[PDB]
């Protein structure tokens, strides 16, 4: 008998609530793990993109390939002989 | 307590224990009922055009961090730091004294990393330095008005950076540190909430189209000697804005002592009377309801009508009678006024409202104003002569461009949007498709015919449009859409009074229209139709 | 050794350029050109040279659909008169340059 | 070695099933579980710094808890006549363990005291075995007083033949809290044991004088700006509120309490579970102490006086320890070096506390059935 | 004198208390794990913001080297580029 059963049931329900849902739960642990994985993937993508842009800047400091590519892409120009095909 | 050999002693002991426990309880609940949170700033979102070119990046800068409590222990070092910081010693001293009780103040904001660290290393009177983010606009002057600046706090202040301030300025985080009485962070322990970085924003502007439009408008302003100008390029199908330029444009990152006109967005605050450019909508409404045949002849002679104290005069009155196509070609006003007389002006107001004239724009820009479209239960002759004619109706450049795009979309009024629209919105069919097609072909003819508009012909593309002039001092307006059988881009050109050129739209704005729209269609890969 | 197509590119992108070569060969075999070389500047530009001497230039990003646009343009418009063609540029949003 | 145990009959292996005192067992089990939970919560960060395993102290405390429950069962097997006849040997072994602690060759050094023995994996603190042995010997002396010469002057100093040297040697290494708890247990046992008021006052005043005399020239080891912790622990009670911030969500334990799992467990408990949690724990401690006193009252009713005095001694050990530790965490007292009976992490403290609980349950059973 | 008896639901109460202890230990360890994961995510976001700061610096450095005016001038004057005429360009489909 005793009210200890009621007290233990209430405490167990409250602690299971705080354990499975809410702040500091296992659900938030899974969230944060998913966020860690997503942010790590984003970090790899960003650190590759930064290297690519750094190399592009370095070639800009001495080369003309980037200028040619940008002129072809944005401005739509074309070298001698032309014969531009569009669709 | 009765069972003990000495109940008195047990009672005394229990009472003493309860008294001590009562003292403990009193000190716990009756008396009781460092570590500080510091925010983690969030990386501002990147603004990019519809293709991928960045328009607003968050480059880093090194900002010197000042703790006044440390400077009051090294006051003797104040002149030495002030010499490198480029301020008077008295100014530094009085600023610190005014900020005596404060825990954190700023010395400078945008000092470069390679010299701010040198400044904080050469002199060390407890001064710190942080590498914070500040807005940089690689496009710069071209998109200055569409992509507005941010203040020194790095929040929106004008343009799309305050229109989309919530979307870009991510939610900052919080964390707990060991800060003593002086304020030095002993250790970093726990982050109670991580900072949410800003979400990258993609605009509808085509930076190639924006560059071309800005260059053409700059040439128009320089050779034509006009005071100001505007030019909005739109995609009819998706209803978005492909370009927006205002030649008085400023530099959004080097904002040292900029006049307002330089920072004014002359496409959504500068309102004007559309004049002749609004006639196609009025006559389309006449076609829709009044059963007015496009080939019908209207007696425009003598080209001057008297209505009380109001008089309507045409630019040319040599033609005795003109059809609707002749009315638009000659920019006749008496004919369209008589047509509006023969029809209901309530339908005129409805058709002008449903296309977005002076009602509102979905842009929601901070620096934005709406036009005035008068509404009345009854329409007198003077009111409809000032309403169907753009002589009392006020609209902005963006509203006129949106209306012309809707007219070019076979009457499908697509809502305005600056963000890159991925799927075509349904919109609303303001104009019946056959009436819209007739008006599109007629606006093709007016710029094709030998009338007052011939310079607007796009080389290789059989363009369309109408030229009009405001009087509040003349303002040159020209809106139109280039592709005939399948319009793809509709745009408006607005420029203020030209000092060394005629104020007629077909002479001072039609060449600009043709020049920018030729490249605009070339980079949009639309097949020619001429 | 010389018969095999030589692979060029950044030191740490040597694995990526191999997969790109596999994809390009798979998407280019029906068109008749045989890959002789493939170079990558660290920028991300892709240079393709065939056995017949004609060269294809592809910029960074959107290679997967730029190559498909090249396939379409060649196989329905450019499939004839390839002898004079010695330089092909794909660095356009949708267009193609022939030389 | 198991001949001293009596599995039949016993509070668990009785013919009537299991017949121990449920209120005391429930209170002590609630305290033990709350102690395990609070040790885990407060010791997460503390153990993370020392070893890579966050559950270092929590797993050690769980192992000590299982060992303590086993020890409680073993003690509840043990009859009280064996304690009565073994008191002298227990006193001698407590003396020996404490002296061996004093020796630097086997005792391990701490920041401000040497009150442990290595024993490899598991530590032993004889400062609590000494308290229990003093309680048992004092009960034996109290029952012998009623049978030997009345008010004999030779028997007046008999407690101080043991209480004074043990107090002095427990002060030898800095353990003032344990000495005060042991002396409080002895003095209160005697007050409840029938010692005359004038005689008891003389004993207590001479004991206090002897202790304040012996507190001098006792450094940590001989032959065979610290207020920030308390200041930031007092903040925990205020910031916990009437309803606490929950398990593990404590804050002061992460910066200002490296002893959040040993000494300041009550501050962490009152911050995580709030002022209502602190009041509930205080009520639990008071109920368990008063139950251990009423068990002695009942054993006194059944004319089993040694059991009555042993229960008084154990109840007063618990009273002194928990009162001093709480009044130090709440700031009333300055004696830093003490741990809570059940909630604190202490290894040998938990085993000895469970043995005391078993002894009290044995007293309760024996006062009913033989 | 007499004998006592444990409550009828002794085993059920013991199981409930064991479950309560396990739940409380799990709550404490879950809160600690969440705080550790918050610290790890802060480190990851700091790395991301460092990478984005470097990218912004690289973009600012490229901006002086890349602009419509400069690119057009280099294409025309140096690379001898030309804008194709609408008639010159052969369009497909």
Author numbering:
A (entry chain D): 6 to 92
B (entry chain B): 6 to 38, 52 to 490, 502 to 559
C (entry chain E): 172 to 270
D (entry chain A): 1 to 224, 237 to 382
E (entry chain C): 4 to 96
Authors' account:
FtsW belongs to the shape, elongation, division, and sporulation (SEDS) family, which functions in cognate pairs with type B penicillin-binding protein (bPBP) family transpeptidases for PG synthesis. The septal PG synthesis is a key step in cell division. As PG synthesis is the primary antibiotic target, Fts complex holds significant antimicrobial potential.
However, the mechanism by which FtsWI is activated is not fully understood. Here, we determined a cryo-EM structure of FtsWI bound to the regulatory proteins FtsQLB at 3.3 Å and performed mutagenic studies to reveal the molecular details for understanding the mechanism of divisome activation. The FtsWIQLB complex from Pseudomonas aeruginosa was expressed, purified, and visualized by a cryo-electron microscope (cryo-EM). The high-resolution cryo-EM map allowed unambiguous assignments for the FtsWIQLB complex, except for FtsQ, of which only the C-terminal β ectodomain (FtsQβ) was resolved. FtsI contains an N-terminal single TM segment (FtsITM) that interacts with FtsW in the TM region and a ‘trophy-like’ C-terminal structure composed of a transpeptidase (TP) domain and a pedestal domain (FtsITP-pedestal), interacting with the FtsBL coiled coil in the periplasm. FtsW comprises ten TM α-helices (TM1–TM10) and a large extracellular loop. TM9 inserts into the central pocket with an angle, together with TM4, TM6, and TM10 forming an outward-open cavity. In our structure, the h2 loop of FtsW is stabilized by FtsL. Moreover, this stabilized h2 loop also positions the putative catalytic residue D275 to interact with conserved residues in the central cavity of FtsW.
